[PDB]
Amino acid sequence: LRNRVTDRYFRIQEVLKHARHFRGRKNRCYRLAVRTVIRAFVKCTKARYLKKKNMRTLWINRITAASQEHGLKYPALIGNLVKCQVELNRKVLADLAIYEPKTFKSLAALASRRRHEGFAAALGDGKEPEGIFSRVVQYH
């Protein structure tokens, strides 16, 4: 019995279909396209880490841009919102800085007020009571 490949056409079309949008001979020649489709798939897997990294970097720039309009720096906003137990991530703050400018200014005022409270507490030796917004809600 002699066996020959009869469905070799279907084995090469499943790889060439991913290369139809390429440029040059690497969209129709199986030998050339297979080495490009594999690299395209490899870049697809490794770009999932970059997309998460790039989104956060984009959010930081947008948060920084809006903070400067209110005379604040990015470390001064994120750092002082943590001490108020306001757990808002960069995704929300970037959205708030774009679609809710009035709400973002309220957060900037809260962060600025909390920032000023820490400086006042740093000047004292603990005799004066803590700031109004410096109180922390305890959970048991």
> In angstroms, what CA-CA distances link 88 with 19, 76, 94, 119?
42, 14, 10, 23
State yes or no: residue 41 binds other proteins (CB under 8 A): yes
State yes or no: residue 137 binds other proteins (CB under 8 A): yes
Structure-token pair, residue 17: 């279909």
Interface pick for other proteins out of 85, 116, 120, 124 (rule CB under 8 A):
85
State yes or no: residue 109 binds other proteins (CB under 8 A): no
Distance (Å, rounded) from C-alpha 75 to C-alpha 23?
A: 45
Other beta carbons within 10 Å of 80: 23
* Cβ at position 72, least distance to other proteins in Å: 17
Binding site for other proteins (CB under 8 A): 18, 20-21, 38-42, 44-45, 84-89, 91-92, 95-96, 99-100, 102-103, 106, 110, 132, 137-140
